[PDB]
Amino acid sequence: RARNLTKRVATLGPSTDVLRPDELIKFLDLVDGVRINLAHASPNEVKFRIEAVRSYEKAKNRPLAVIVDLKGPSIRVGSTSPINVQEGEVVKFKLSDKSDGTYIPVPNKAFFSAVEQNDVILMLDGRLRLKVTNTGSDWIEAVAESSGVITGGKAIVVEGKDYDISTPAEEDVEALKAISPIRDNIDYVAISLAKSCKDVDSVRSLLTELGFQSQVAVKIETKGAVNNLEELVQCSDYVVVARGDLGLHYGLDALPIVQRRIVHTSLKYGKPIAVATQLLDSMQSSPIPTRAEINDVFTTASMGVDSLWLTNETASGKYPLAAVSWLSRILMNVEYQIPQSPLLQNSRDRFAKGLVELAQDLGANILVFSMSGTLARRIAKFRPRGVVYVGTPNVRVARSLSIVWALEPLYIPAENYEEGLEKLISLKGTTPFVATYGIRGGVHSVKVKL
Amino acid sequence: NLTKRVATLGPSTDVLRPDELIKFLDLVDGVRINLAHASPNEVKFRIEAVRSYEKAKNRPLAVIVDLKGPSIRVQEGEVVKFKLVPNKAFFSAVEQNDVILMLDGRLRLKVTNTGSDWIEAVAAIVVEGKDYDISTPAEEDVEALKAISPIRDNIDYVAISLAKSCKDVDSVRSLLTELGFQSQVAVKIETKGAVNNLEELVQCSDYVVVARGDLGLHYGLDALPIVQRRIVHTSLKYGKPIAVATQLLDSMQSSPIPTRAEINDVFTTASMGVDSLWLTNETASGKYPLAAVSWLSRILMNVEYQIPQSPLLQNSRDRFAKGLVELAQDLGANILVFSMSGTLARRIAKFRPRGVVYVGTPNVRVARSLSIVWALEPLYIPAENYEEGLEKLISLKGTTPFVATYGIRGGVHSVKVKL
Amino acid sequence: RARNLTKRVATLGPSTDVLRPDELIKFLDLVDGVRINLAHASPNEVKFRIEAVRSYEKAKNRPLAVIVDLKGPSIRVGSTSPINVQEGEVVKFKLSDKSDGTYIPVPNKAFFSAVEQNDVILMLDGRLRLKVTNTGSDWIEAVAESSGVITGGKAIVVEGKDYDISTPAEEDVEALKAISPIRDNIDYVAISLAKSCKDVDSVRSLLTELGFQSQVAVKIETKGAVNNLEELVQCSDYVVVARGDLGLHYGLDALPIVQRRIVHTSLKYGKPIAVATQLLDSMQSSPIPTRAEINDVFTTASMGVDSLWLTNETASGKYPLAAVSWLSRILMNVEYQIPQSPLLQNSRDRFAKGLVELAQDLGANILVFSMSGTLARRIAKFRPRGVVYVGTPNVRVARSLSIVWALEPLYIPAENYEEGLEKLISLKGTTPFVATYGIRGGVHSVKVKL
Amino acid sequence: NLTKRVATLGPSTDVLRPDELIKFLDLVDGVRINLAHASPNEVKFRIEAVRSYEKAKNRPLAVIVDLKGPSIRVQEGEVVKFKLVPNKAFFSAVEQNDVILMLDGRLRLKVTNTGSDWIEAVAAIVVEGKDYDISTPAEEDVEALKAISPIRDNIDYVAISLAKSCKDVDSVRSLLTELGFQSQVAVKIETKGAVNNLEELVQCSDYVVVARGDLGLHYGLDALPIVQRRIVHTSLKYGKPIAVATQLLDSMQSSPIPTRAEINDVFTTASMGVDSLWLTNETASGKYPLAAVSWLSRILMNVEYQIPQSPLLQNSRDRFAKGLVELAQDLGANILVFSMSGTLARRIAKFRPRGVVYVGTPNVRVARSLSIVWALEPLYIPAENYEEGLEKLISLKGTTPFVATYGIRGGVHSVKVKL
């Protein structure tokens, strides 16, 4: 009840910007990490939000993860005066960056390559659907299922289809170097719309080129990502179920099974897993969630995900504090249903599993001294059922581990492993405990007090 | 479809045109009538409509009748008073700092002063966290049952409200027997008192119901998922059919599509392995009754089930039933049961077979009863003896592979297996 | 205790021939099957022994298996006056059917192909060992490790080497047609020195050519058989650990592991398994066995073998009756150690396994109605822990099943399965019972009384 | 070599030439001296020879001393009489139809008449199936122990005969403590009375011994394998080291090669997972002592072990030990233990690790004690503290992979793992 195993991530936006210095404290006290969406964030909004986060972290001695979420590529209506669409109207799309008023301009051939007859085109976030009735060289006709106004610059998605667009997106490249002066304060970079390992690697090389030392979080947002889940999971540092986005490509009744499959796959492969968006959605307008939202959060957390990410609920909603407060409160009630076990792929895995089961058998807390976070993460993936205290001499490692299952990262300067572990045991050595360190090729050490 | 679907009839189902009523009943396995709200003649008309559909479509449906139970029947900040509230047991239960709840827990009154035949508090009647000590069955449950007793042969389940002990349940059973009912007793778990007494209460029930609305009044909003889970796990452990009722597709009272959170809630609740889910207000009085059962049924078709709590093996008929389920599962086979009482069918269902179980029976009332038990598909099959009945069931539903069975306590059990 | 699960096989010889009509009854009352060794058996000895067996079977209504054991090929010293060998003497072997006195004649090139320098040659049942010191075209020199007399016609074995000799042996072919007039009374034919599936198939085709309807029992006698165990087991009807013979090719300390491996392999593949020879060996001279022999029989039976075969103990020994009496008595004491489970290779296997575990769970006896013995055998291989009553309308099937684990075969004439099963239930239907029949492609029926 | 080898010293080992004695002691992990047969000076000379070898070869050996115990000390068909047989308890125990056994059960006498101070019967002294009621320790056990008490620091195990209750065992323990012994008490299970009381007796023993010779007198020849199995299974269940003694290579008294049946018996007995096997007559008085231990040791090198009865987990030190064994097994690693008392080493051994466990200790007496426990290879390692001792053990036997450990009750347990 008292300390959460499921980690709590909130998105920062205008609703958090205006928080009284004292409201802000009570808000950050209830999170383990923060997200900044580089779609809606100005470089000096990013800079100022991160500064407020790091300032809080210093004052309260609480390592917090900073996540930046990249926009990713998009296909948008080109230049046009607003086009008014009537229900039943046959609407024409042409490959063009500018129309003469008689059609909808779409400046990307990948839209035309993705669309077939009977596909459904989604505009206005999914509020305008158009049924495709004919296709040609660089054009499409579609029947509007309702009335609506199409504006230049609005995004276009094809229900259940992925766009074949070269990556990383030019706008992502631009956003990453704009923010590169503060790269040492960024713990996770979240990739949108990746569907192959090649896509992920490209962002990795770019982040390296630009001097970032960040974990790469891969959002599963589309049918194409779901069909390539095995390989995508294995090339990620962190996996994210992006519910809002995935809801565009699946029926609303089909989404629970897809969420389950993403979560099962990530746990199997020992990748940390998040569920994002549409958790406490009603709370944009209400200081209390609905009963169904409480059950939703409760059962999502029970599956054994590492973290839950609030988006609009905190970014733009009316009750950012109530939202994180209700998140944390629900989590304190969670009983976890025996999670998918990860695959054992080496000796170190067998060691960590044996440790976790031992601590479970003795009713013991696990303590880890970890230089880079490696053993701490290996322990976490086996889902220990109590808090795992992790001592580290690197503040950047402490921040990274803040959003990993059960981990409580503590900044502890130390000359070597043995000195580090003894400082951690001094500090957190209530009985029973199982305390370890160990690196590949070295002696692994365990101190057990029963 | 393994999880069974129950809808409540009310004003909104009454007004349905003939073709719309067919589409509605096609999407449920049983129906609930709330005796609190229905008049005797609404009860009669709704049962007649159900049995008439059942005869036309050749599909047995359970009729559940829901009893009111022994319940006790404004400005922000006001000091409000209460008086002989015709029931004494209210003033016996209430204390200082207790919360009194009104209009379904919408307005809360923190008791400032306790008196004698009175109380005062700072803004059906409930005391949060407390059970009233009212002797059972209530007078008006006796009245309601006596009044529908001429239609008793068409009542499959009688659902009891506010039980907290086996005595509550046994008393209703005696009353039903006296009035000539042959109904199963469904016990709603609605209070802290029921939850604290869960073990004994589950074991003396014929069917257990998580009544989420009523129970939500005694628990925090964030505490109720754990309680639902304990209730479901306990019923499954003791081999009792289990339903979750109310607050499933609540937003559908005003919209023909549920929220995503409601879809997830329905999905995860079904995934636990409950026998049935009961819609209440969403169909009884809501604007979109057909959309509601259409959506329940659709969500259920996507469900993948999570390995349920296994029941205790209490005897060798249990070991027999469990072995048949594991056998059928290992052969990829359907189970067929011929039964006069439904007893072997229910024993097999409690081990949660993952395919439809076809149950042949010559007793139409048994077939109606089984329609809201997990996985069971009951078919009316007249037969002179068990062997003949099983031969006819196989003849009718014997797509291979199958495991087909009958047997009663102390008799030779027969199994036919086609691989 | 009262009825054995492990079946008891005795070899008939001169010691049983002379049994008083009344001693014979008490002897056969204690066996489930009889072996006749066609090495030492004259066709009219075979005929008369079988007649006495079938006569007893009729009188006592007890189906008994008759096993005939084939001689198999051998390499024997050719024609020569006795050769006296001194310890340390360098002895010469030449390819020849007749010597001039100066060497040992061996009329089979396969001997010369099998022998290398440092091999050990075994004569006089293993009592004369010779160490090979040089080899040539069609000759060998070897140093005698002790004194001895080599006689023409004596057998020669190379320790740990197999002979490449074409099969079936001409003498086996001769013995099988000599006995072919009484072929309908022969239930098992035991093959010596097979080391490939081809060898087994050749005996199968010969037995078919000659009108036999017998199960083929394959003796594992050599290192070459042990190295080809997987395939040899899978082509057998019945497997036999021939301890005496295998003891020539392995150290005496190495034999327990080889026995275990043969038994484990046979159980895995659902082949009935016997252990033969050297069970109650001291009993040739004593009416009581040694303590070590009691432990040996006890532990061999515990492994879950279908049968134990006495050889010399009954064939030529002084106490044939005490020997079978002590065998049966020891078995009544056996507690069985959870045997190797057979592989599930079809639906019928899953059915039979499920039945056996069910009967185990209900504390029930299994009853089977079986036309050819097929389901009865499939049940037996899963090692039910109580007697399995088997009704059959074929007396030849009843005899076959007599030496299969736990089976009690009963001759029951019946028109069909359903009538057969109801006669069996009438006869053996003490509660609890699990009674079945079923053939491939048909309805399998189970009657369960709890 | 995981199963430990014990030989009895006697006339045949005494006469061994220096080089032959070295070859003999090289093939055992402990030695037994039978105080029934040895004089005090044979005891002294044989212990001195053992400790002298141990010092020269740097290998600790357990010295087991076997106590006589409270035992009571012709033509075919004759009527034989018995008289105040100096012990009364004989005539208290014997009845009509009982069998009296003489000269190791070779001749049997069926009691025809019971008298008072006498008996008559139709053809050490034993009554088949019966235990005498003689108070313990016996006078001559007190005598034998007092007489070897100056060499007590060189006695690792004292083996008790004919115990049937915890009181028998506790009494010997008090006597040993009084005389200043620090020996383990080995309890021989030798009678029906011990077997009927097996549960309590096993739990108060330091080491359990199946004495097949003595026990064979009270059971049928065909009944003894089941009894041995129950004894072994029970000791393993309660985490007690277990030996099988006598009648292992009996024919080797007169032949330098065992029978096949004896090889099988040794093999299957070792395969059950016993700590040790004890040769008695085969080495003490037989013609071929060296061949006997040479053959025991050879058979043991072929043994494949059958998954043994697992011990009860009674506390969290047990859960710790078992987890280390399973860990080492999963890593393909050797276990190293540094220990002052041998307690953690014995706790690890009872979970039956399938590799050698190297145990470092600065207490030579502990090292001698551990040499007849399953899998343990004790090394004398002087160390100032536990950390230093484990560092030295690792330095010496740290072939990777290894799981290396120390820890005492209520202290921080330390494990070092190299993968």
Domain boundary among C141, C166, C191: C166
D417 at interface of A, judged by CB pairs closer than 8 A: yes
| Claim to verify: residue C340 and residue C320 sit in the same structural domain | no
Q: In what order do the strands lie in the sheet with D99-102?
A: D79-83, D118-122, D107-114, D99-102, D126-127
C128 with C141, same domain: the answer is: yes
Angle at the Cα of D92 from the Cα atoms of D87 and D98, rounded to 5 degrees = 110
Question: Do residues B296 and B4 lie in contact, with contact meaning Cβ atoms separated by under 8 Å?
Answer: no
Which strand (E) or helix (H) includes residue A329? helix A320-331
Return all residues near C21 (Cβ < 8 A) that are at least 6 apart: none
Give chain A's count of helices (H) and strands (E).
17, 21
Q: Please, is B223 exposed, middle or buried when counting C-beta atoms within 10 Å of its C-beta (0-12, 13-18, 19+)? A: middle
CB B370 within 8 A of CB B341: no
Chain B CA closest to residue C430:
B412
Can you give the CATH number for the domain in which C324 is found? 3.20.20.60
Q: Is D76 one of the annotated binding-site residues?
A: no
For chain A, say whether B262 makes contact (Cβ under 8 Å). Answer: yes
Where do breaks (C to N over 2.5 Å) occur in chain C, by preceding residue number?
none
Data resolution in angstroms = 2.2
Set of chain B residues whose Cβ sits within 8 Å of the Cβ of A295: 225, 261, 264-265, 268-269
Q: Are A102 and A92 in contact (CB under 8 A)?
A: yes
**Whether residues C85 and C52 fall in one domain:** no
| B74 touches C: beta carbon within 8 Å | no
Q: If you count residue pairs, one on C and one on D, with CB atoms under 8 Å apart, how many are there?
A: 83
For A292, the closest of B216, B265, B306 (CB atoms) is B265
Q: Is the CB of residue B301 less than 8 Å away from at least one CB of chain C?
A: no
By Cβ distance, the residue of A256, A289, A293 closest to B302 is A256
- In sequence order, which residues have a C-beta less than 8 Å from that of residue D297 and are 6 or more positions away? D1, D5, D27
Alpha-helix runs per DSSP H in A180-310? 197-209, 223-227, 229-234, 243-246, 255-268, 291-302
Neighbours of chain C (3+ CB pairs under 8 A): B, D
Pairwise CB contact (< 8 Å): A291 & B267: no
Beta pairing, strands C148-150 & C139-144: unpaired
What's the gap in Å between the CA of A343 and the closest CA on chain B? 21
d(CA A367, CA D415): 15
To the nearest 10 degrees (0 to 180), the angle between helices B289-302 and B260-271 is 50
CA angle B279, B284, B285 (to 5 degrees): 125
Number of domains in chain A: 3
Looking at residue D71, what DSSP letter applies?
-
Using CA of residue D159, residue D162, residue D164, residue D169, what is the dihedral sign? negative
Q: Do C256 and D247 touch (CB under 8 A)?
A: no
Rounded to the nearest angstrom, the minimum Cα separation between C386 and chain D is 19
User: Which of D415, D416, D418 is most worth mutating to test chain A (most A CB atoms within 10 A of its CB)?
Assistant: D415
Q: Which residues contact B25 (CB under 8 A, 6 or more apart)?
A: B31, B50, B53, B57, B61
Task: Say if residue A181 is preceded by a cis peptide, omega within 30 of 0.
Answer: no
The CA-atom distances, in angstroms, between B60 and each of B31, B366, B376, D228, D243 are: 11, 9, 11, 64, 70
- Non-local (6+) Cβ contacts of B381 within 8 A are B338, B360, B361, B362, B389, B392, B393, B396
Q: Suggest the residue from A248, A252, A277 to mutate for an interface test with chain B (most B CBs closer than 10 A).
A: A252
Q: Which residues of A are annotated as a binding site?
A: 35, 37-40, 69, 76, 154, 221, 244-245, 277
Say if strands A33-37 and A7-11 run parallel, antiparallel, or are unpaired. Answer: parallel
**Residues C194 and C256 grouped into a single domain:** yes
In this structure, the answer to whether residues A268 and A385 fall within a common structural domain is no
Say if C and A touch: at least 3 Cβ pairs within 8 Å.
no
Our CA angle for C173, C174, C179, nearest 5°, is 100
Domain of residue D35, residue span: 1-69+136-303
The answer to whether B37 and B10 are in contact (CB under 8 A) is yes
Q: Do C175 and C162 fall into the same domain?
A: no
- Statement to judge: residues B147 and B275 lie in one domain: yes
- Name the residue among B323, B330, B414 with its Cβ closest to that of C358: B323
Last residue of a domain, one of D256, D279, D303: D303
**Contact in structure between D248 and C290 (CB atoms under 8 Å):** no
Helix (H/G/I), strand (E/B), else coil: D294: helix
> Tokens for B287?
């604007």
Of C362, C443, C444, the CB nearest to B319: C362
Pairwise CB contact (< 8 Å): C448 & B401: no
DSSP D343-389: HHHHHHHTT--SS-EEEEES-HHHHHHHTTSTTEEEEE---SSHHHH
Is A293 in CB contact (< 8 Å) with chain B?
A: yes
Identify whether residues C265 and C190 lie together within a single domain: yes
CB contact under 8 A, D413 and A448: yes
**C273 DSSP β-pair partners:** C239
Rounded alpha-carbon distances, angstroms, from residue B23 to B250, B287, C145, D165: 21, 16, 98, 80
Structure tokens belonging to residue D249: 């290579």
A179 and A130 part of one domain:
no
- Asked whether B and D share 3 or more beta-carbon pairs under 8 angstroms, the answer is no
Chain A touched by B304 (CB under 8 Å): yes
**Cα angle vertex A425, ends A421, A427, to 5°?**
115
Other Cβ atoms less than 10 A from the Cβ of A165: the count is: 18
CA dist C321 and C341 (Å) reads 35
Query: Mind giving me the DSSP string for A69-137?
Result: E------B--B-S-EEE-TT-EEEEEE-SB--SSSEEE--HHHHHH--TT-EEEEGGGTEEEEEEEE-S
B88 lies within 8 A of chain C by CB: no
Torsions phi, psi of B248, nearest 5?
A: -105, -50
The tokens for D43 are 């005891």
What distance in Å separates the CA atoms of residue B3 and residue A450, rounded to the nearest whole number? 46
How crowded is residue A447: how many other Cβ atoms within 10 Å of its Cβ?
20
A54 and A30 co-located in one domain: yes
Distance from CA of B302 to the nearest CA of A (A): 7
Å between D414 CA and nearest CA of chain A: 5
Q: Which of B229, B246, B213, B239 is nearest to B32 (CA)?
A: B246
CB within 8 Å: A333 and B225: yes
Q: What's the DSSP call for residue B141? A: H
For residue C34, what are the β-bridge partners?
C10, C66
**Does the beta-carbon distance from B261 to A278 stay under 8 Å?**
yes
Evaluated on CA atoms B287, B293, B295, B296, the torsion sign reads: positive
Tally Cβ neighbours within 10 Å of residue B53.
17
DSSP per-residue codes, C266-286: HHHTT--EEEESSSSGGGGT-
For chain D, the chains sharing at least 3 beta-carbon pairs closer than 8 angstroms are: A, C
Distance of CA D305 to the CA centre of its chain: 20
Residue partners of A94: CB distance under 8 A and separation at least 6: A103, A104, A105, A106, A138, A139
Q: How far is CA A90 from CA A96, A104, A144, B112, D220, in A?
A: 18, 12, 7, 68, 100
Helix (H, G, I), strand (E, B) or coil at D335: strand
To the nearest whole angstrom, how far is the Cα of D106 from the nearest Cα of chain C? 13
Q: Is D246 annotated as a binding residue?
A: yes
C373 carries a ligand binding annotation: no
**How many angstroms separate the CA atoms of B99 and B110, rounded?**
5
> How many residue pairs bridge chain A and chain B with CB atoms within 8 Å of each other?
83
Gap from A244 CA to chain B (nearest CA, Å): 10
CA quadruple D24, D28, D34, D40: dihedral, nearest 10: 60
User: Which of A166, A195, A229 is the C-terminal boundary of a domain?
Assistant: A166
Is D2 annotated in a binding site? The answer is no
B331 Cβ under 8 Å from any chain C Cβ: yes
Q: Which residues of C touch D292 (CB under 8 A)?
A: none
The response to whether D32 counts as a known ligand-binding position is yes
Please tell me whether residues B214 and B313 are part of one structural domain: no
B414 interfacial to chain C (CB closer than 8 Å): yes
What is the rounded distance in angstroms from the CA atom of residue A407 to the CA atom of residue D60?
48
Separation between Cα atoms, residue D157 and residue D205, nearest integer Å: 12
Q: Count Cβ atoms below 10 Å from residue B354 Cβ, excluding itself.
A: 10
CA distance B332 to chain C (A): 10
Chains D and C touch (3+ CB pairs under 8 A): yes
Same domain for D192 and D238 = yes
For chain A, which chains pass the contact test of at least 3 CB pairs under 8 Å? Answer: B, D
Q: Write down the residue that tokens 């710790």 correspond to.
A: D320
Q: Does the beta carbon of D315 lie under 8 angstroms from any beta carbon of chain C?
A: no
Q: B152 exposed, middle or buried (CB, 10 Å; 0-12, 13-18, 19+)?
A: middle
Q: H-type helices in B117-206, by residue range?
A: 139-148, 166-179, 192-196, 198-203
Q: Distance from A345 to chain D by nearest Cα, in Å?
A: 12
- CA C286 to chain CA centroid, Å, is 24
Domain harbouring A352, CATH code: 3.40.1380.20
Which domain CATH number covers A103? Answer: 2.40.33.10
Tell me whether C235 touches chain B (CB under 8 Å). no
CB contact under 8 A, D419 and A347: yes
CB A241 within 8 A of CB A309: no
Give the distance from residue D40's alpha carbon to the nearest chain A alpha carbon, in angstroms: 48
3-state secondary structure of D322: helix
